[PDB]
Amino acid sequence: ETPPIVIDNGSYEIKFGPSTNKKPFRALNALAKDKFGTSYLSNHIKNIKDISSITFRRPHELGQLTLWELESCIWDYCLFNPSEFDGFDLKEGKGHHLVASESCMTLPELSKHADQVIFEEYEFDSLFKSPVAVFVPFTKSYKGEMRTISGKDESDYHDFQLVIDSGFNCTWIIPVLKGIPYYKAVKKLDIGGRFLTGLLKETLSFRHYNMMDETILVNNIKEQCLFVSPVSYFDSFKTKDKHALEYVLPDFQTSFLGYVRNPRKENVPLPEDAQIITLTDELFTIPETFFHPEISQITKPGIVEAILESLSMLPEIVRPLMVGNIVCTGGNFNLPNFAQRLAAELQRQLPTDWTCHVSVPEGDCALFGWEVMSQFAKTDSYRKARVTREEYYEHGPDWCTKHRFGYQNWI
Amino acid sequence: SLDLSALANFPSFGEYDKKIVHQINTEINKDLEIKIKTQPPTGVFLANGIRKKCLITNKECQYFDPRTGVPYSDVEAYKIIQRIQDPISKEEDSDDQVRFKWFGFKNGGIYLDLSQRPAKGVPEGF
Amino acid sequence: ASRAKLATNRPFEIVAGLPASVELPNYNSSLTHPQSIKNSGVLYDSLVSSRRTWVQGEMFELYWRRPKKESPTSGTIPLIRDKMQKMCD
Amino acid sequence: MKALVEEIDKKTYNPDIYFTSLSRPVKRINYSLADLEARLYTYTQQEILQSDRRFMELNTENFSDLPNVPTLLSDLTGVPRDRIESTTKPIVLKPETLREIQLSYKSTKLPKPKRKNTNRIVALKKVLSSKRNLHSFLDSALLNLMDKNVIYHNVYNKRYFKVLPLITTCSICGGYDSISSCVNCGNKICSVSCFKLHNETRCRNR
Amino acid sequence: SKLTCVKNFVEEVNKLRETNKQLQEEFGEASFLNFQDANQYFKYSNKQ
Amino acid sequence: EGEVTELTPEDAENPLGGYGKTISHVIVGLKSAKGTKTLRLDPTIYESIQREKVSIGDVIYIEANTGAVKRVGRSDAYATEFDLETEEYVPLPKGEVHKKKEIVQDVTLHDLDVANARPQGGQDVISMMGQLLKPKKTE
Numbered sequence A: 001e002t003p004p005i006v007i008d009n010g011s012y013e014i015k016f017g018p019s020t021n022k023k024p025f026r027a028l029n030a031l032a033k034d035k036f037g038t039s040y041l042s043n044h045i046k047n048i049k050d051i052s053s054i055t056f057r058r059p060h061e062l063g064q065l066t067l068w069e070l071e072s073c074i075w076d077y078c079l080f081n082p083s084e085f086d087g088f089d090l091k092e093g094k095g096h097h098l099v100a101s102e103s104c105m106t107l108p109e110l111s112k113h114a115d116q117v118i119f120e121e122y123e124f125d126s127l128f129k130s131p132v133a134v135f136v137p138f139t140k141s142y143k144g145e146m147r148t149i150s151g152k153d154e155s156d157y158h159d160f161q162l163v164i165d166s167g168f169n170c171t172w173i174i175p176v177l178k179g180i181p182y183y184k185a186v187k188k189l190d191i192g193g194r195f196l197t198g199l200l201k202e203t204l205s206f207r208h209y210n211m212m213d214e215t216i217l218v219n220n221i222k223e224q225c226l227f228v229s230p231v232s233y234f235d236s237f238k239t240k241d242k243h244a245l246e247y248v249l250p251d252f253q254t255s256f257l258g259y260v261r262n263p264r265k266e267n268v269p270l271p272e273d274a275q276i277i278t279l280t281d282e283l284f285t286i287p288e289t290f291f292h293p294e295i296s297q298i299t300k301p302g303i304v305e306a307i308l309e310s311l312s313m314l315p316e317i318v319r320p321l322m323v324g325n326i327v328c329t330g331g332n333f334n335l336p337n338f339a340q341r342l343a344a345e346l347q348r349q350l351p352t353d354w355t356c357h358v359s360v361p362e363g364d365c366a367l368f369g370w371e372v373m374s375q376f377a378k379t380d381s382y383r384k385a386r387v388t389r390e391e392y393y394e395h396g397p398d399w400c401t402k403h404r405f406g407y408q409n410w411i
Numbered sequence B: 001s002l003d004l005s006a007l008a009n010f011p012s013f014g015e016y017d018k019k020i021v022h023q024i025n026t027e028i029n030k031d032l033e034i035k036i037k038t039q040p041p042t043g044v045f046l047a048n049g050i051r052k053k054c055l056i057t058n059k060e061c062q063y064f065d066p067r068t069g070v071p072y073s074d075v076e077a078y079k080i081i082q083r084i085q086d087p088i089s090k091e092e093d094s095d096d097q098v099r100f101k102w103f104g105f106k107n108g109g110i111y112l113d114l115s116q117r118p119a120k121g122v123p124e125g126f
Numbered sequence C: 001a002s003r004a005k006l007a008t009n010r011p012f013e014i015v016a017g018l019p020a021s022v023e024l025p026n027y028n029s030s031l032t033h034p035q036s037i038k039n040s041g042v043l044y045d046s047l048v049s050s051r052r053t054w055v056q057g058e059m060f061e062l063y064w065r066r067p068k069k070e071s072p073t074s075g076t077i078p079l080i081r082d083k084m085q086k087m088c089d
Numbered sequence D: 001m002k003a004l005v006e007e008i009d010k011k012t013y014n015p016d017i018y019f020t021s022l023s024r025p026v027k028r029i030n031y032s033l034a035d036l037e038a039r040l041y042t043y044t045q046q047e048i049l050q051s052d053r054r055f056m057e058l059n060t061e062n063f064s065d066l067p068n069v070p071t072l073l074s075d076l077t078g079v080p081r082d083r084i085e086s087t088t089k090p091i092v093l094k095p096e097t098l099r100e101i102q103l104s105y106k107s108t109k110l111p112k113p114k115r116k117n118t119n120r121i122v123a124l125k126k127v128l129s130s131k132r133n134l135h136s137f138l139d140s141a142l143l144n145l146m147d148k149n150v151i152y153h154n155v156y157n158k159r160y161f162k163v164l165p166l167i168t169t170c171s172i173c174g175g176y177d178s179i180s181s182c183v184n185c186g187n188k189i190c191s192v193s194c195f196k197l198h199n200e201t202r203c204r205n206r
Numbered sequence E: 001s002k003l004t005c006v007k008n009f010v011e012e013v014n015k016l017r018e019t020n021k022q023l024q025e026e027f028g029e030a031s032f033l034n035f036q037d038a039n040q041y042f043k044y045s046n047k048q
Numbered sequence F: 001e002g003e004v005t006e007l008t009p010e011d012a013e014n015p016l017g018g019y020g021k022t023i024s025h026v027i028v029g030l031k032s033a034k035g036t037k038t039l040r041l042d043p044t045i046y047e048s049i050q051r052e053k054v055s056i057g058d059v060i061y062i063e064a065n066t067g068a069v070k071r072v073g074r075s076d077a078y079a080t081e082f083d084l085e086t087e088e089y090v091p092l093p094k095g096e097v098h099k100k101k102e103i104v105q106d107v108t109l110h111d112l113d114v115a116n117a118r119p120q121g122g123q124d125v126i127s128m129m130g131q132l133l134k135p136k137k138t139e
């Protein structure tokens, strides 16, 4: 007997840990090399001093985990090394129940490869993996603390729920019906954290000096200071000076990472040798791409279009309940005023009869997927659903990915 | 009300079969009105009142298939068309059943039954 | 040949001017808003094409064709009639 | 105030058309043989294709991966590579990677090896020695036409394209109080400073 | 003024109100909680 | 009240049903801060719409008490549709599309007397000529 091990293979950070553990760990799934060829791995990337031109190699080419080599390296580093990761150590893998996560639309061959390697090479006793939206309805099984907002004012899983999974790669609209996503109505919003970081790079480089290479600097900027307009783009643009902020550039002799200051608030003076970049419009004009892709000259339909289409493609009888039970998750949703604005726009688009209740977890929304996945893993539903090592051995390798987990079973 | 019974039929985190996807498409099709520009030709008669000639048999067409819109002369014609449809003859010697396949020829294509027994004397691999 | 060059990545290929694939069509997986066979007519087009081709195809080597019109070429019609003998249907 | 009597010419007058108009200063003329050739040979398809290519370019993180975009875009859309390379104007694994992994091995310490042989183990080596890119997977015949088209395309929106209103902002600073279109290429500007910036750096007709 | 139709409105309102009373008796304890059943949401929507 | 999204006039199911144009009900779609509603209107309300010159996107205001249609203006959403245009852009109405309010006012008896003596109704030329006249007190 052993508690299941849960790992969330993020395309930008990996959230993993034993089911008994309270809070998960972090693992930047990216192989880096600096200008002088010295290569950094996983959390070593956070330890870089030559920020300027560090190049990031990743296993997820386009949201699809293609290159196994670095995936295996990162897995082995995070699973084996106990010293950095609070003593957690996957001794040898055999006789360990593993619940994992993957991109909601993975190629059948890629999923076959994934199941084959994770089963034969790692030799786990049992394995489950699926998109986080599959685990989202299970939130009923535990007393979660998730704040909720309604758009019309200022048996261990929920049968009807709609999941918006906004991560590093892409924003997914995944409606799940009684724990199986309605895969023909699944719609992908191509906007995501990678795009948003690139747009930050672009607009910083246009308005100020060229920051096109300063990957970790712009990432720290994005972490420190972005927000969606509380009402509309016009409202934020009118008071740009009132809500203006300045970000202090990193000083390699004192701080490899920069930081943001609020000019209005009283704070310590900056040294005269420190270069400062003021942000007055890019704070809100960049996040507004989500609702108005024309702003950043993108022909794709936006988030409200995508959500309304996904609602439309659903069965008529169930779609109002799906509207009422929409839940938001992912790294991107943590940025302020995104959930409120999305709820307001969604209610404004829908007929007055229906009401939308939007619930987003408090705190860092990226960690929510790991939490709900773990709380699901400790339920009888996981015990019934899970597939065993010998049962995989009995079937030919395509059988598992084509029946147990992958989209192919339905479509 | 019947949709609620259909909803209970929907997969419930189990091992359910593809047939649901047909219902899914049924709901999906409801998204918008169909902007069919030009209505397809219908019926068994020409504009002058003369009966159409069967494409299968060259007999004068007697009936018209409302689902596919292919007019047919006789029951045999309809059956042959249906066998062209339903490629997997779900009887579930099964491979010996008439299996029409389409072969592309210079400037056009023809339907060929791979179960056709060729003339006596064909070599191995014919 | 002048038929519209199919948009990239369609789940079908245009063979002999018609949408076809080597594998058996999986409409249910691939189509969200399938037009009826009535709406498509692809089957109809295929059938007409098939029959016409069988009337005009390369199966048997062609040897005589009615000449596309005091030209003596009219007088050759009875000669070509007599050069063959008549046999039953 | 207002002219109650107007004189008109029956040739020039109609309600359809109202028109009025005025180091050597002269209109620029474009010696672009490519553009002239295009003119004689001939959102639009080219415009949306360029916008999509710009979107995909902006999505990618590392600058060194920029000249690998056209192959990926051709594989994803299905369009020929030469068409996107020429008509549209923009803006991996080696044994050395194995050596870097060997250097990366120094962090991991715990795992221990073993020995066995079978063709299953040969295939186990084969997956762990692929060294092939997502482009190879998409071009691979094992990924079927229906599977590929469903997975990439079906998740894209097909009927709704814009249901929020349309918001135009300054091309330099995003302002909206006043807007006008520059005489040289028709992109939209809001202020004199933005006009000077568009003329010096931005404007694309020069 | 003599042919006003107030009785027709009142009668139809009472027939609706008695149908609604029967439906409320059938449903039981009505609530505005988040719906997890199609039947419950349908009945609440019909009530409103 | 709200912003018009759709306006699809319908004719009678049979041409013999009515006279002349034989215009049946009109369907209008209004948008508010709390959602949208599709309304079915009388042909008289459609005539009022035609009189007020309402197009798609204009914020309107219909009183079921009398059947009077008012054109508030254009939505602020479409403010930047054209970079030079004379249009009174107005924000999207707050609250629900169909809001019922109880109005309380204090009116004098003399106010009623004046209203009866000098009514403001009528759109005839005679009405306009009387409107231009000074409001002299009469016994």
Ligand SMILES: Nc1ncnc2c1ncn2[C@@H]1O[C@H](COP(=O)(O)OP(=O)(O)O)[C@@H](O)[C@H]1O
Pocket: A009, A010, A011, A012, A013, A014, A166, A167, A168, A169, A170, A193, A194, A222, A223, A224, A330, A331, A332, A334, A335, A366
């Ligand atoms: N404090 C923050 N502020 C804004 N965005 C954040 C913050 N923390 C994380 N993110 C976003 O979350 C993304 C990573 O989310 P993650 O859960 O790793 O998604 P995925 O599952 O796609 O890997 C990053 O790209 C980043 O843009």
Ligand code: BEF
Pocket: A009, A010, A011, A012, A063, A103, A167, A168, A169, A170
């Ligand atoms: F790993 Be993710 F959701 F891009």
Ligand SMILES: [Mg+2]
Pocket: A009, A010, A011, A167
């Ligand atoms: Mg994720």
Ligand SMILES: [Zn+2]
Pocket: D170, D171, D172, D173, D174, D175, D189, D190, D191, D194
């Ligand atoms: Zn400007």
Ligand SMILES: [Zn+2]
Pocket: D182, D184, D185, D186, D187, D198, D202, D203, D204, D205
């Ligand atoms: Zn210009």
